[PDB]
Write a protein that binds this ligand. Structure first.
Ligand SMILES: *C/C=C(\C)c1ccc(-c2ccc(N(C)C)s2)s1
Length: 133
């Protein structure tokens, strides 16, 4: 299924600090952020997506259309400019962010009741699982 609509509560988080280290997020921010449970709110209509990642410590929102390249400032994440593109590979939603960092982006897919996410930067992969609320 390509339907990722929902409010998604984090169940599992693996190597989040490795991914943040690869982005060069400062020590104090990484040490606080790694402790925290996350929420992911996805609003999906056709190719139009609105995605919000939240914790008690951050709020990161992005809007995009599948298959339409967009230039992006990554704002309070790591304050970098990238050229982003989100596409479907089967039922995996794939984001590539072209810029200074290699292998940067993410992948999301549905397994039954749960949303699975990979966040990638450099040689680091963070793996997350969310449950549908
Ligand atoms: C599809 C998933 C996306 C776009 C994101 C998942 C996590 C973030 C994020 C983690 C930390 C952030 N800040 C701002 C410290 S943002 S985005």
């Amino acid at each position: 299924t390509r339907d990722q609509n929902g409010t998604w509560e984090m169940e599992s988080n693996e190597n989040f600090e490795g991914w943040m280290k690869a982005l060069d997020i400062d020590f104090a921010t990484r040490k606080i952020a790694v402790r925290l449970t996350q929420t992911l709110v996805i609003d999906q209509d056709g190719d139009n997506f609105k995605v919000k990642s939240t914790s008690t410590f951050w709020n990161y929102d992005v809007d995009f259309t599948v298959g339409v390249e967009f230039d992006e400032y990554t704002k309070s994440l790591d304050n970098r400019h990238v050229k982003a593109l989100v596409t479907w590979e089967g039922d995996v939603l794939v984001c590539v962010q072209k810029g200074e960092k290699e292998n940067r982006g993410w992948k999301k897919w549905i397994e039954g009741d749960k949303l699975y996410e990979e966040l990638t930067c450099g040689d680091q992969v963070c793996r997350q699982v969310f449950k549908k609320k």
